[PDB]
Amino acid sequence: SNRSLIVTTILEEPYVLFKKSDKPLYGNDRFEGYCIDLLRELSTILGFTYEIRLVEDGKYGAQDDVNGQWNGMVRELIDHKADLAVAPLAITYVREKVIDFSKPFMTLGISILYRKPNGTNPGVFSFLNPLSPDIWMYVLLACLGVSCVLFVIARFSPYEWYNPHPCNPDSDVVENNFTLLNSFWFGVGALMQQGSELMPKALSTRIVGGIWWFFTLIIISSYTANLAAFLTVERMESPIDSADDLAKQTKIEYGAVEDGATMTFFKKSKISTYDKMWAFMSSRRQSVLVKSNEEGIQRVLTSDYAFLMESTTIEFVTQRNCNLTQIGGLIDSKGYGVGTPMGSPYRDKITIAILQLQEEGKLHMMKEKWWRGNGCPEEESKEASALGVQNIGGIFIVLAAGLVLSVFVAVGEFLYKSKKNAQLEKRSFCSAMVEELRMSLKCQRR
């Protein structure tokens, strides 16, 4: 006998698919998928003929309170029109009574879907983060302002106007140090904690030094302390890693398909978490609470949703929307299972198969083929802890900018000297080149 063992199916992608091609019939070759390749191996060992038949109305099905009158693949079966049923069916309490299931061939579970953490893009000039945008300006104003005072005070101070009485003292000349540019030098050097050569000696100049030196120490120790906070706090941040983490978070908000066995567990929950979580479900039962998985994928993209879903469909989209990720552990336990009529001469024959193919490893091999594919951009790390270029970075651009300006002035130094010198001395450029290569004089002489 054949009977075709009238086998019900349901389009879900990956489990079964229309063949992706041209030409006609493909009769029982039309459908190609996991369940197809499973069915194949069921056929090899027990032996039978398979005529695929999509169910009508396309339903997993359930006992609808109106009349019961199961609405789907359960229905083609219970009336014994159907035979074996090889599709996502999700063993349950209520379905088991009326129709007896095989033993599982897959272990799914409820878990959360969320977008991957994008990155930081610190803004390579992150070093200039820990204080305001405004304070750095005023610190710059102060070094000019204070330095302007050192010039005025020191110059006007009779206790400055010391003498450059050398190592050989007892001559008589005065020669201040605190000219203008050297005044800024005291400011910039103190501000960077390396002490310049020039120093106050008269009290007035010493007071201003003593206070700038205070003005420095607080800014720097505060710069150090902020940056330790920004870095420590960042290090101290964990992403969400559980329903409990999401439970305490009235930020990134929940999501779920309408009843779809997902609300079902939550309504009938007794977990304090999943009881609390349900509160928000009911709360925004117009917004989040979507009515399809395809939207729930689309929705997490646009925004900060966390769609609850069976783990199998997580795995597929994760590996095909690498923007996105699984999170958490398997919340619940369930498992798909090939359907059989009320107690029949196949359930105990179809079950030994599933155990047989298991030991040989064909299922997990089959698990890879359909769900796995092109190697995702998995390459990604969070070793960010140790700082790198993207963290600090900019200071090297600041370094480069510095060295460049020194060149341009150093050229400017050359021109100004020889020109002003040549004004009272020889013509113009005779000086320039003889002065150029006498800087070169292969020794420190002249």
Ligand X SMILES: CC(C)CCC[C@@H](C)[C@H]1CC[C@H]2[C@@H]3CC=C4C[C@@H](O)CC[C@]4(C)[C@H]3CC[C@]12C
Contacts with ligand X, residue ranges (CB under 6 A): 124, 138, 141-142, 145-146, 159, 179, 181, 203, 389, 393, 396, 399-400, 403, 409, 412-413, 416
Q: What is the DSSP letter of 252?
A: S
Q: Are strands 52-54 and 110-115 parallel, antiparallel or unpaired?
A: unpaired
CA 342 to chain centre: 50
Tokens standing for residue 179: 């000219």
Segment near ligand POV (CB under 6 A); pick from 96-104, 173-181, 264-272, 283-291? 173-181
Written as one string, the DSSP assignment of 78-130 is HTTS---B-S-----HHHHHHS-B---S----EEEEEEPP------S--TT-S
Question: Which among a copy of itself, ligand 2J9, ligand POV, none contacts residue 146 (Cβ within 5 to 8 A by kind)?
Answer: a copy of itself
Name beta bridge partners: 253: 305
Is 142 known to sit in a ligand binding site?
no
Q: Which pairs from 16-24 meet CB under 8 Å and 24+ separation?
A: 16/87
Q: What is the DSSP letter of 29?
A: T
Asked if 152 interacts with ligand POV (CB under 6 A), we say yes
Residue number of the CB atom closest to ligand POV: 444
The rounded distance, in Å, linking the Cα atoms of 40 and 424 is 104
Q: Which pairs from 282-288 meet CB under 8 Å and 24+ separation?
A: 284/253, 288/253, 288/254, 288/255, 288/256
- Quick one: 197 or 378, whose CB is closer to ligand X? 197
Residue 15 burial (CB < 10 Å; 0-12/13-18/19+)?
buried
**Which residues lie below 8 Å from residue 193, measured CB to CB, with a gap of 6+?**
216, 220
Q: Are strands 7-9 and 52-54 parallel, antiparallel or unpaired?
A: parallel
Is 53 known to sit in a ligand binding site?
no
Question: Which among ligand X, ligand 2J9, ligand POV, none contacts residue 104 (Cβ within 5 to 8 A by kind)?
Answer: ligand 2J9
Residue 168 exposure: Cα atoms within 13 Å on the Cβ side: 1
Q: Are strands 31-32 and 17-18 parallel, antiparallel or unpaired?
A: antiparallel
Question: Which among ligand 2J9, ligand X, ligand POV, none contacts residue 206 (Cβ within 5 to 8 A by kind)?
Answer: none
Binding mask 84-113 for ligand 2J9 (x = CB under 6 A): -------x-----------xxxxx------
Question: Which among ligand POV, a copy of itself, ligand 2J9, none contacts residue 148 (Cβ within 5 to 8 A by kind)?
Answer: ligand POV
In whole angstroms, the minimum distance from the beta carbon of 35 to ligand 2J9 comes to 13
- Quick one: 389 or 443, whose CB is closer to ligand POV? 443
Is 353 known to sit in a ligand binding site?
no
Is 310 known to sit in a ligand binding site?
yes
- Quick one: 299 or 334, whose CB is closer to ligand 2J9? 334
- Quick one: 119 or 169, whose CB is closer to a copy of itself? 169
Instruction: For the segment 337-396, give every residue that binds ligand 2J9 (CB under 6 A).
Output: 354-355, 358, 363
What 3-state class would DSSP assign to 167? Answer: coil
- Quick one: 296 or 328, whose CB is closer to a copy of itself? 328
Out of 14, 189, 260, 335, the residue judged to bind ligand 2J9 by CB under 6 A: 335
Question: Which among ligand POV, ligand 2J9, ligand X, none contacts residue 180 (Cβ within 5 to 8 A by kind)?
Answer: ligand POV
The rounded distance, in Å, linking the Cα atoms of 303 and 288 is 11
- Quick one: 385 or 440, whose CB is closer to ligand POV? 440
The rounded distance, in Å, linking the Cα atoms of 372 and 319 is 7
Query: 186 to each of 176, 213, 269, how far by Cα in Å?
Result: 14, 10, 71
In whole angstroms, the minimum distance from the beta carbon of 135 to ligand POV comes to 23
Asked if 249 interacts with ligand POV (CB under 6 A), we say no
Is 90 known to sit in a ligand binding site?
yes
Out of 173, 386, 403, 443, the residue judged to bind ligand POV by CB under 6 A: 443
Instruction: For the segment 253-292, give every residue that binds ligand 2J9 (CB under 6 A).
Output: none
Name beta bridge partners: 113: 326
Closest CA to 50 of 31, 63, 64: 31
Cβ-based neighbour number of residue 47 at 10 Å: 7
Residue 151 exposure: Cα atoms within 13 Å on the Cβ side: 14
The rounded distance, in Å, linking the Cα atoms of 311 and 336 is 12
Out of 49, 282, 333, 406, the residue judged to bind ligand 2J9 by CB under 6 A: 333
Is 175 known to sit in a ligand binding site?
no
Instruction: For the segment 174-213, give every residue that binds ligand POV (CB under 6 A).
Output: 176, 179-181
Q: Which residues are annotated as a binding site?
A: 88, 90, 95, 261-262, 310
Q: Which residues are annotated as a binding site for L-glutamate?
A: 88, 90, 95, 261-262, 310
**Positions that interact with ligand 2J9 (CB under 6 A):** 91, 103-107, 333-335, 354-355, 358, 363
**Positions that interact with ligand POV (CB under 6 A):** 148, 152, 176, 179-181, 440-444
